[PDB]
């Protein structure tokens, strides 16, 4: 309770799985929240499932859409006052090796996973700096920002980019006394409805050779590290990677 | 509030600075706490400053003392019930290059910073495994576990050792279903009375070439990441490094 | 002598500085070399400065040009036989923070530094796999693939991407028994004519707070690690980062 | 040929496997070499197998023996002139989890793998600094200096320590203009007679979940990266980790 009092957060891809848990816990801690998704049918229901409009709203947006990011910030500020917190969570995967990645797949993934995080980080800094908000940008950056996977070539590119770009932004913010921190969160495999719909997926990810705990995590595992990073508890953490992966990258 | 309900923690070097803040916040979150220090004059006062004996006690112990670690666990369990949480925080520094480190300095530092963390981790696993406690071992492992410093040669050895030994322990615990997690915390420079007593130290550490935020942190910065790691909030985090350094290692 | 016998290498941006030294040493070790650059006036002279057409040729190409990559491989194979070795060295920098990066700057840098390395890596794997060449792809990936710099936001994104994408490609190649290795090289600051033309640059980069050796490196420093990685000497190295930075990332 | 002309190297544990290959290639490149081992029966034969006394000699020494390190340097200098190159290669393993490591096992491993590297690094700096030798200290620091293994607890401690202590030493040497570089080499699994004598070991290490290349390496794989690091080719590399692991740490 109260760990995010007065905060105003945008969470991209906040309508499902990890994003929805982050929104849920954010609201529970006192934050006002705008969640996004490219699809309105999902977002409208999702917000209501978490709370009332005074707590949480939906804004339809594809994070790859530059001009829409401005509209998104404006809508959030209209609803809740100046934004203090941005979680760049929206992402997609292509299940291809580097060898087998089409250029169209490449461009499509980089638009969401890399351009979208860039657009959101850049705008966030511009909108949140110098306001005494204890502003925090949390970029979702995966175990796949640390290690490769033979069948996630473009994904790996996107996640390594986010990992180090976030450091750049953290440093400039720190050096300029912007009162904006930038950090990355690195989930291992997390159980969601989508993983549940992929036959064999959770079992494959739970083999000790993949996740040493022998099971995968749950959305709240990612929500809790996000609360810490959005809160003023983490006011001396910037430019750092926070990994919650059941041991996946420790071996 | 309540984030550590039912937990029983040992914090080595819990009587001053970072250790004392960790103890303070632990108590505030519902944990029972045993703090240690080689010196009784400090520890007795420190416990009382935080809370009552039903919340927090002192046990005199040098973390380099193998046999005393057993006594410590036994005393904690006597006071509060089975231990769920160990923060290996006690440490010393020698201000020498590798070139200029005496063998006596070398052995003395490794006894506290490395043997002591080993003794505590080993015993913790043995005492906490298979009890359904949501057991967590948090090993203090420094920015100096990631980068070198020309005048911290033995310290760097100790902190790199702790960093990777903790991974080993995390993995074995995960693979064996012990219900024990092991992670490391990596503070940058933190303001304490001891730093305050070193003329010029805080200013030197606050230069942008050292800490990009332009200032050093405070004990509570380390306390809050420890709360997260001791709590069940972090139940899928094991084998990972959590850095709170004001940007120091990001550049 | 003879360390690259029978090898056939493409080096992008091989006409100046690091790329030219890599080409020079490659030729000296027995490799046939095709160097590229967007500008013909530079490339023609550069090749001749190193050796004869039977040793080294120029092919005009912007690494951001997908279709030209095919033409490049075809020309190299025509000149020298099947390609065994690719050094993705061409790159540009934008001297902007994330905050201050225009979208046009962003797209332009990612086209050369990220898309171009992707196009070259993908094609290289397709053309070099399963031929018994001891094939090696060496991706230039910078100190800026490890740490951030406040004024290199897009560059940092590109270099982090290359760093982890290269791991993906290495893994798939290894798992499929392609006889292709993929590794990254991470230069610190290196003295070239371009650095010489930037007043104050070498001095700034040589401050101990930047490069602990107190001076910057020279093109041959990067050439020699490339020889090792192109040669069969490195036949068990794949998926790894090789840093030659005068200590820059060690502190 | 000639890549180590004029160099004078000590290689600890130079009589078998990786150490012997490093000695062999060193001699082949023009270096004079003193190899060590605790056992004389092995060392005497080993030297002769590589070359003549004017090229390579044996000195009986346990790297855990502080006072013997001085004797070792003195003997080398007597034979070949001032030492330019030290490869701290001697090491042992205990096949125990942290939980199950006895204190005697702990102390024994740390004596060889950590104290021994410290003694050798410290003395090397003192003996090699300020002599214009292009001095290089290469510390063997394992894949187990990057990731944990549940059954290599003390080993992991030792290898993480070496990894970061080497950075400290590199930095001090660089900052003081000592003309001594310090770097670490990180082998994955390598085929030797000892591995051959462990039934099932090579097959277990060659599973794609362990080594993605599907096979383990050979002693020369480690020799070649050592040649590069001992040579002046690497004169701008210090404080860095060089990994040759068949992909083991890339996934
Ligand atoms: N589910 C897992 O096991 C897992 C594991 C590792 C990492 N991740 C990563 O963590 C993050 C969060 O995952 P999640 O569970 O909310 O995902 P999910 O798989 O359950 O659903 C995908 C999410 O991304 C959003 N999304 C996709 N494209 C978008 C776009 N153009 N604009 C806005 N939103 C978009 C959706 O709203 C949705 O919340 C992602 O960046 C993903 O790359 C997930
Ligand atoms: N103060 C800083 O700026 C800073 C910065 C980086 C890291 N650290 C590290 O963080 C950890 C915590 O620091 P702190 O502020 O509690 O320290 P402090 O500098 O204020 O005081 C030293 C601490 O270590 C304990 N200690 C020392 N030797 C001991 C032994 N043999 N047995 C038991 N206790 C012992 C003391 O109780 C005390 O709490 C340490 O491991 C240290 O290495 C501190
Ligand atoms: N010079 C330094 O101090 C330094 C330091 C760190 C990293 N780097 C990096 O190392 C690599 C090599 O540098 P260099 O010294 O050959 O560079 P240089 O600065 O001397 O000249 C730039 C190089 O890139 C090439 N180039 C640029 N855009 C290109 C395109 N679209 N297509 C083909 N070629 C292109 C040029 O041929 C030229 O060789 C680059 O990836 C760069 O990002 C350089
Ligand atoms: N063999 C592998 O598969 C493998 C894999 C990863 C790492 N390593 C590591 O690489 C290094 C070299 O291995 P190697 O193949 O020469 O080993 P080896 O297993 O074939 O034989 C052990 C080596 O260590 C030496 N040694 C052990 N204790 C010693 C002491 N107290 N003093 C002096 N010498 C001592 C011996 O001379 C011998 O060369 C070691 O540090 C080891 O920890 C080996
Ligand atoms: C972690 C991850 O990227 C992923 C991607 C595609 C399918 C399943 C998992
Ligand atoms: C962080 C650290 O180790 C230190 C050591 C000695 C003095 C001041 C700081
Ligand atoms: C290393 C590097 O990226 C750089 C970029 C621009 C100018 C000078 C150096
Ligand atoms: C790499 C390694 O440490 C090892 C140790 C013991 C047995 C086999 C391998
Ligand atoms: Mg791994
Ligand atoms: Mg640094």
Give the closest of A224, A235, A250 to B239, CB-based.
A250
Distance CA A181, CA C172 (A): 36
Give the closest of D174, D241, D247 to C247, CB-based.
D174
Transcribe chain A into DSSP letters. Answer: --TTTT-EEEETTTTSHHHHHHHHHHHHTT-EEEEEES-HHHHHHHHHHH--TTTEEEEE--TT-HHHHHHHHHHHHHHHSS--EEEE---------TTT--HHHHHHHHIIIIIHHHHHHHHHHHHHTTSSS-EEEEEE--GGGTS--TT-HHHHHHHHHHHHHHHHHHHHHHHTT-SEEEEEEEE--B--HHHHTSTTHHHHHHSTTT-TTSS-B-HHHHHHHHHHHHSGGGTT--S-EEEESTTTTT-
Q: Which of D92, D90, D83 is nearest to D34 (CA)?
A: D83
Report yes or no: C230 and C185 within 8 Å, Cβ to Cβ: no
Give the closest of C224, C234, C250 to D239, CB-based.
C250
In D, minimum Cα distance to C178 occurs at D213
To the question of whether residue A192 is assigned a binding role by annotation, the answer is yes
C155 in catalytic set:
yes
What torsion do the CA atoms of A171, A177, A180, A184 make, to the nearest 10 degrees?
20
φ/ψ (deg, to 5) at C87:
-110, 110
The set of chains that have 3 or more CB pairs under 8 A with A is B, C, D
Q: Which 8-state DSSP code applies to residue D179? A: S
For B178, the 3-state DSSP assignment is coil
Report yes or no: B30 and B6 within 8 Å, Cβ to Cβ: yes
To the question of whether residue C249 is assigned a binding role by annotation, the answer is yes
Q: ∠ at Cα D118 (D116, D120), nearest 5°?
A: 70
φ/ψ (deg, to 5) at B248:
-55, -45
| Tokens (6 digits) for C195 | 């650095």
The set of chains that have 3 or more CB pairs under 8 A with B is A, C, D
Measured CA distances, A19 to A112, B167, C217 (Å): 15, 28, 45
Burial of C145 (0-12, 13-18, 19+ CB in 10 A): buried
Determine which one of A155, A178, A189, A248 is catalytic: A155
Query: Looking at residue D93, which CATH number applies to its domain?
Result: 3.40.50.720
Is B246's CB within 8 Å of A238's CB? yes
Which residues of B are catalytic, by number?
155
**Residues whose beta carbon lies within 6 Å of some atom of ligand 5:** A 93, 95, 142, 144, 152, 155
How close is the Cα of D90 to the center of ligand 4, in Å? 5
- The neighbour count for residue C193, using CB atoms within 10 Å, is 8
Distance CA A19, CA A3 (A): 18
On the CB side of C56, how many CA atoms lie within 13 Å of its CA? 27
- The neighbour count for residue C77, using CB atoms within 10 Å, is 14
For D83, the 3-state DSSP assignment is coil
How close is the Cα of B18 to the center of ligand 2, in Å? 7
Is D244's CB within 8 Å of C240's CB? yes
Q: ∠ at Cα A110 (C127, C89), nearest 5°?
A: 45
Distance CA B220, CA C172 (A): 45
Measured by CA distance, the residue closest to atom 1 of ligand 4 is D190
Q: End-to-end CA distance of chain B, in Å?
A: 35
Is C221's CB within 8 Å of D213's CB? no
- The neighbour count for residue D199, using CB atoms within 10 Å, is 8
Cβ neighbours of C243 in D, within 8 Å: 237, 240-241
Strands C135-140 and C85-88, bridge-based pairing: parallel
| Tokens (6 digits) for B214 | 């332009």
D130 close to ligand 8 (CB < 6 Angstrom): no
The experimental method, as deposited, was X-ray
For B160, the 3-state DSSP assignment is helix
Give buried/exposed letters for C160-182 (b at 16+ CB in 10 A, else e). Answer: bbbbbbbbbbbbbbbbbebbbbb
- The neighbour count for residue C203, using CB atoms within 10 Å, is 11
Measured by CA distance, the residue closest to atom 2 of ligand 7 is C93
Distance CA A195, CA A206 (A): 12
Instruction: Give the distance from residue B211's alpha carbon to the nearest chain C alpha carbon, in angstroms.
Output: 12
In D, minimum Cα distance to A152 occurs at D251
Q: Which atom of ligand 8 is nearest to the CA of D95?
A: 6
- The neighbour count for residue A95, using CB atoms within 10 Å, is 13
For D248, the 3-state DSSP assignment is coil
Distance CA B194, CA B198 (A): 7
Cβ neighbours of C249 in B, within 8 Å: 147
To the question of whether residue C84 is assigned a binding role by annotation, the answer is no
Q: Which domain holds residue B158?
A: 1-251
- Torsional sign, CA D144, D147, D151, D156: positive
Measured CA distances, D218 to A12, B135, D27, D228 (Å): 49, 42, 18, 17
Length of chain D: 251
- Torsional sign, CA C225, C226, C227, C228: positive
Instruction: Report the run of H or E that residue D182 belongs to, with start and end.
Output: strand D180-187
Report yes or no: D110 and B90 within 8 Å, Cβ to Cβ: no
- Domain total of chain C: 1
Measured CA distances, A46 to A39, A41, D171 (Å): 11, 9, 53
Q: End-to-end CA distance of chain D, in Å?
A: 35
Q: Which 8-state DSSP code applies to residue B184? A: E
Distance of CA C235 to the CA centre of its chain: 19
């Amino acid at each position: 309770s109260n760990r995010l009092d007065g905060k105003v957060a945008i969470i991209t891809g906040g309508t499902l799985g990890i994003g929805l848990a982050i929104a849920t816990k954010f609201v529970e801690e006192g934050a006002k929240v705008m969640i996004t998704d490219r699809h309105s049918d999902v977002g409208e229901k999702a917000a209501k499932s978490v709370g009332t409009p005074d707590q949480i709203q939906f804004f339809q947006h594809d994070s790859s859409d530059e001009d829409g990011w401005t509209k998104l910030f404006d809508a959030t500020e209209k609803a809740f006052g100046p934004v203090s917190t941005l979680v760049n969570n929206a992402g997609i995967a292509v299940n291809k090796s580097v060898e087998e990645t089409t250029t169209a797949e490449w461009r499509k993934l980089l638009a969401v996973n890399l351009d979208g995080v860039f657009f959101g980080t850049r705008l966030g800094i511009q909108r949140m700096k110098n306001k005494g908000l204890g502003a925090s940008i949390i970029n979702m950056s995966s175990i796949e920002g640390f290690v490769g996977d033979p069948s996630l070539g473009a994904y790996n590119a996107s996640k390594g980019a986010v990992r180090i770009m976030s450091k750049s932004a953290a440093l400039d913010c720190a050096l300029k006394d912007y009162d904006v921190r930038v950090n990355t969160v690195h989930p291992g495999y997390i159980k969601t409805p989508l993983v549940d719909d992929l036959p064999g997926a959770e079992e494959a990810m739970s083999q000790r050779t993949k996740t040493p705990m022998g099971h995968i995590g749950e959305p709240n595992d990612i929500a809790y590290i996000c609360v810490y990073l959005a809160s003023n508890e983490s006011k001396f953490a910037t430019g750092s990677e926070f990994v919650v992966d059941g041991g996946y990258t420790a071996q």
